[PDB]
Amino acid sequence: KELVVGTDTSFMPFEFKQGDKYVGFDLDLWAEIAKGAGWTYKIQPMDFAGLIPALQTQNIDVALSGMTIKEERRKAIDFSDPYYDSGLAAMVQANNTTIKSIDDLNGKVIAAKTGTATIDWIKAHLKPKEIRQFPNIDQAYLALEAGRVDAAMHDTPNVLFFVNNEGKGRVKVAGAPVSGDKYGIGFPKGSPLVAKVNAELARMKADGRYAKIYKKWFGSEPQ
Protein backbone atom coordinates (compact mmCIF):
# COMPACT_ATOMS: atom_id res chain seq x y z
CA LYS A 1 0.00 0.00 0.00
CA GLU A 2 1.15 3.51 -0.88
CA LEU A 3 1.27 5.38 2.45
CA VAL A 4 0.01 8.94 2.77
CA VAL A 5 2.46 10.78 5.03
CA GLY A 6 1.08 14.04 6.50
CA THR A 7 3.97 16.49 6.85
CA ASP A 8 4.13 19.99 8.44
CA THR A 9 3.85 22.92 5.98
CA SER A 10 6.96 24.50 7.62
CA PHE A 11 9.01 23.30 10.60
CA MET A 12 12.75 23.87 10.00
CA PRO A 13 14.99 21.88 10.15
CA PHE A 14 12.60 18.90 10.38
CA GLU A 15 10.43 19.68 7.24
CA PHE A 16 10.68 22.84 5.19
CA LYS A 17 10.52 24.04 1.57
CA GLN A 18 13.93 24.50 -0.13
CA GLY A 19 13.42 25.65 -3.72
CA ASP A 20 10.69 23.34 -5.16
CA LYS A 21 11.47 20.50 -2.79
CA TYR A 22 10.74 19.67 0.85
CA VAL A 23 13.80 18.56 2.85
CA GLY A 24 14.73 18.03 6.49
CA PHE A 25 15.64 15.68 9.35
CA ASP A 26 12.13 14.08 9.54
CA LEU A 27 12.12 13.52 5.75
CA ASP A 28 15.56 11.84 5.74
CA LEU A 29 14.73 9.78 8.83
CA TRP A 30 11.47 8.58 7.32
CA ALA A 31 12.97 7.88 3.90
CA GLU A 32 15.44 5.52 5.63
CA ILE A 33 12.77 3.80 7.76
CA ALA A 34 10.59 3.38 4.58
CA LYS A 35 13.50 2.00 2.57
CA GLY A 36 14.36 -0.63 5.23
CA ALA A 37 10.71 -1.66 5.70
CA GLY A 38 10.10 -1.77 1.90
CA TRP A 39 7.24 0.80 1.87
CA THR A 40 6.42 3.32 -0.81
CA TYR A 41 4.85 6.62 0.19
CA LYS A 42 3.89 10.14 -0.79
CA ILE A 43 4.00 13.16 1.44
CA GLN A 44 1.16 15.60 1.94
CA PRO A 45 2.21 18.95 3.33
CA MET A 46 -0.41 20.44 5.71
CA ASP A 47 -0.58 22.88 8.59
CA PHE A 48 0.15 21.25 11.94
CA ALA A 49 -3.37 21.77 13.36
CA GLY A 50 -4.78 19.34 10.72
CA LEU A 51 -2.39 16.39 11.44
CA ILE A 52 -3.84 14.92 14.63
CA PRO A 53 -7.39 15.17 13.26
CA ALA A 54 -6.27 13.58 9.98
CA LEU A 55 -4.73 10.69 12.00
CA GLN A 56 -7.97 10.21 14.00
CA THR A 57 -10.00 9.93 10.78
CA GLN A 58 -7.41 7.68 9.04
CA ASN A 59 -7.02 10.27 6.26
CA ILE A 60 -3.23 10.00 6.57
CA ASP A 61 -1.28 6.89 7.68
CA VAL A 62 1.72 8.71 9.18
CA ALA A 63 2.44 12.23 10.55
CA LEU A 64 5.90 13.82 10.44
CA SER A 65 6.09 17.12 12.31
CA GLY A 66 8.59 16.98 15.14
CA MET A 67 5.44 15.91 17.01
CA THR A 68 5.82 16.11 20.76
CA ILE A 69 4.91 12.87 22.61
CA LYS A 70 2.14 13.72 25.18
CA GLU A 71 0.02 11.40 27.26
CA GLU A 72 -3.04 13.44 26.34
CA ARG A 73 -2.42 12.93 22.63
CA ARG A 74 -1.89 9.16 23.15
CA LYS A 75 -5.61 9.05 23.96
CA ALA A 76 -6.29 9.91 20.26
CA ILE A 77 -3.20 8.68 18.36
CA ASP A 78 -0.20 6.31 18.50
CA PHE A 79 3.46 7.34 18.60
CA SER A 80 6.70 5.70 17.53
CA ASP A 81 9.51 5.47 20.04
CA PRO A 82 11.17 8.86 20.61
CA TYR A 83 13.61 9.97 17.97
CA TYR A 84 14.67 13.48 19.23
CA ASP A 85 15.03 15.37 22.51
CA SER A 86 13.67 18.90 22.32
CA GLY A 87 12.22 21.75 24.36
CA LEU A 88 10.80 25.25 24.14
CA ALA A 89 12.58 28.60 23.67
CA ALA A 90 11.55 32.30 23.71
CA MET A 91 12.57 34.61 20.82
CA VAL A 92 12.69 38.43 21.07
CA GLN A 93 13.91 41.24 18.74
CA ALA A 94 17.75 41.76 18.72
CA ASN A 95 16.76 45.21 20.02
CA ASN A 96 15.21 43.88 23.21
CA THR A 97 16.80 44.50 26.57
CA THR A 98 13.71 43.91 28.81
CA ILE A 99 13.00 40.16 28.51
CA LYS A 100 15.84 38.27 30.19
CA SER A 101 14.12 34.96 31.05
CA ILE A 102 10.94 33.03 30.06
CA ASP A 103 9.49 34.32 33.44
CA ASP A 104 9.63 37.87 31.99
CA LEU A 105 6.93 36.83 29.50
CA ASN A 106 4.18 37.23 32.17
CA GLY A 107 2.09 40.23 31.14
CA LYS A 108 3.48 40.24 27.56
CA VAL A 109 2.08 39.50 24.09
CA ILE A 110 3.50 36.18 22.90
CA ALA A 111 3.25 34.95 19.23
CA ALA A 112 2.89 31.20 18.91
CA LYS A 113 1.63 28.51 16.47
CA THR A 114 -2.01 27.29 16.52
CA GLY A 115 -2.57 23.76 17.74
CA THR A 116 0.99 23.15 18.98
CA ALA A 117 2.26 22.05 22.37
CA THR A 118 3.69 25.55 22.84
CA ILE A 119 0.22 27.00 23.53
CA ASP A 120 -0.55 24.33 26.19
CA TRP A 121 2.75 25.04 27.89
CA ILE A 122 2.20 28.81 27.97
CA LYS A 123 -1.34 28.33 29.33
CA ALA A 124 0.00 25.93 32.00
CA HIS A 125 3.02 27.96 33.13
CA LEU A 126 2.72 31.65 32.25
CA LYS A 127 0.19 34.44 32.78
CA PRO A 128 0.63 36.44 29.45
CA LYS A 129 -1.29 39.50 28.33
CA GLU A 130 -2.12 37.69 25.09
CA ILE A 131 -1.34 34.55 23.07
CA ARG A 132 -1.44 35.66 19.42
CA GLN A 133 -1.91 32.55 17.33
CA PHE A 134 -0.66 31.95 13.80
CA PRO A 135 -1.23 28.86 11.66
CA ASN A 136 2.49 28.70 10.75
CA ILE A 137 5.47 29.71 12.83
CA ASP A 138 6.97 31.82 10.01
CA GLN A 139 4.21 34.42 10.57
CA ALA A 140 4.81 34.40 14.34
CA TYR A 141 8.40 35.37 13.67
CA LEU A 142 7.36 37.99 11.12
CA ALA A 143 4.98 39.53 13.75
CA LEU A 144 7.99 39.73 16.12
CA GLU A 145 10.26 41.32 13.51
CA ALA A 146 7.58 43.87 12.75
CA GLY A 147 7.29 44.72 16.47
CA ARG A 148 3.65 43.61 16.81
CA VAL A 149 4.41 41.14 19.69
CA ASP A 150 6.91 41.24 22.53
CA ALA A 151 8.15 37.69 21.92
CA ALA A 152 7.51 34.38 20.11
CA MET A 153 7.91 30.92 21.58
CA HIS A 154 8.34 27.55 19.95
CA ASP A 155 10.40 24.39 19.83
CA THR A 156 14.06 25.03 20.67
CA PRO A 157 15.72 23.72 17.51
CA ASN A 158 13.23 25.70 15.26
CA VAL A 159 13.89 28.92 17.21
CA LEU A 160 17.67 28.34 17.22
CA PHE A 161 17.68 27.51 13.53
CA PHE A 162 15.79 30.72 12.68
CA VAL A 163 18.02 32.84 14.90
CA ASN A 164 21.13 31.48 13.21
CA ASN A 165 19.90 31.58 9.61
CA GLU A 166 17.06 33.77 8.26
CA GLY A 167 16.76 35.78 11.55
CA LYS A 168 20.52 36.47 12.06
CA GLY A 169 20.87 39.92 13.64
CA ARG A 170 17.11 40.71 13.73
CA VAL A 171 16.00 38.32 16.51
CA LYS A 172 17.64 36.42 19.40
CA VAL A 173 16.94 33.78 22.10
CA ALA A 174 15.78 35.28 25.40
CA GLY A 175 16.83 33.36 28.51
CA ALA A 176 17.37 29.62 28.64
CA PRO A 177 15.27 27.00 26.85
CA VAL A 178 13.18 24.59 28.90
CA SER A 179 14.11 21.04 27.93
CA GLY A 180 12.58 17.56 28.52
CA ASP A 181 10.28 17.08 25.51
CA LYS A 182 10.54 14.15 23.03
CA TYR A 183 9.41 13.77 19.43
CA GLY A 184 7.63 10.79 17.88
CA ILE A 185 6.26 9.85 14.48
CA GLY A 186 2.41 9.98 14.69
CA PHE A 187 0.02 7.24 13.52
CA PRO A 188 -3.69 6.42 13.73
CA LYS A 189 -4.68 4.66 16.95
CA GLY A 190 -4.00 0.92 16.62
CA SER A 191 -1.92 1.34 13.39
CA PRO A 192 0.07 -1.81 12.51
CA LEU A 193 2.92 0.34 11.08
CA VAL A 194 4.17 1.26 14.59
CA ALA A 195 5.99 -1.95 15.51
CA LYS A 196 7.97 -2.01 12.26
CA VAL A 197 8.84 1.70 12.43
CA ASN A 198 10.12 1.10 15.98
CA ALA A 199 12.31 -1.81 14.78
CA GLU A 200 13.78 0.17 11.88
CA LEU A 201 14.52 3.12 14.09
CA ALA A 202 16.27 0.97 16.80
CA ARG A 203 18.41 -0.49 13.99
CA MET A 204 19.32 2.91 12.50
CA LYS A 205 20.29 4.06 16.01
CA ALA A 206 22.37 0.93 16.66
CA ASP A 207 24.15 1.02 13.28
CA GLY A 208 25.03 4.72 12.80
CA ARG A 209 22.46 5.69 10.19
CA TYR A 210 20.59 7.73 12.79
CA ALA A 211 23.90 9.51 13.71
CA LYS A 212 24.72 10.34 10.05
CA ILE A 213 21.27 11.91 9.55
CA TYR A 214 21.55 13.83 12.82
CA LYS A 215 25.06 15.10 12.04
CA LYS A 216 23.77 16.38 8.64
CA TRP A 217 21.14 18.62 10.18
CA PHE A 218 22.49 19.50 13.61
CA GLY A 219 26.25 19.73 12.91
CA SER A 220 27.27 17.88 16.11
CA GLU A 221 26.83 14.18 16.95
CA PRO A 222 24.09 13.17 19.50
CA GLN A 223 5.24 20.51 18.30
UniProtKB/TrEMBL annotation:
It holds the Pfam family SBP_bac_3. Keywords: Signal. The keyword Signal applies. It comes from the Bacteria. It comes from Burkholderia pseudomallei (strain 1710b). The gene is glnH. InterPro entries: Iontro_rcpt_C (IPR001320), PBP2_GlnH (IPR044132), Solute-binding_3/MltF_N (IPR001638). The keyword Glycoprotein does not apply. This is Glutamine-binding periplasmic protein. GO terms for molecular function: ligand-gated monoatomic ion channel activity. Residues 2-221 form the Solute-binding protein family 3/N-terminal domain. GO terms for cellular component: membrane. Residues 2-220 form the Ionotropic glutamate receptor C-terminal domain.
